[PDB]
Design a protein around this ligand. Structure first.
Ligand SMILES: CCCCCCCC/C=C/CCCCCCCCOC(=O)[C@H](O)CO
Ligand SMILES: CCCCCCCC/C=C\CCCCCCCCOC(=O)[C@H](O)CO
Length: 22
């Protein structure tokens, strides 16, 4: 469960960082 949480959160960070760069 914690792995899943951390992974979702890391991925959302990635998505939001990429969108900000674009
Ligand atoms: C029997 C099969 C059952 C399947 C199990 C249920 C699966 C439910 C699926 C959920 C997928 C939703 C993912 C969230 C996408 C949002 C991207 C977030 O993007 C962003 O961060 C914004 O674009 C920022 O502006
Ligand atoms: C700025 C926007 C930030 C958005 C933050 C999103 C955080 C991610 C949200 C939830 C992570 C929960 C993981 C779910 C696994 C199931 C837990 C339950 O698992 C279990 O073990 C059962 O209870 C017992 O079988």
């Amino acid at each position: 469960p914690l792995v899943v949480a951390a992974s979702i959160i890391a991925i959302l960070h990635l998505i939001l960082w990429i969108l900000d760069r674009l």
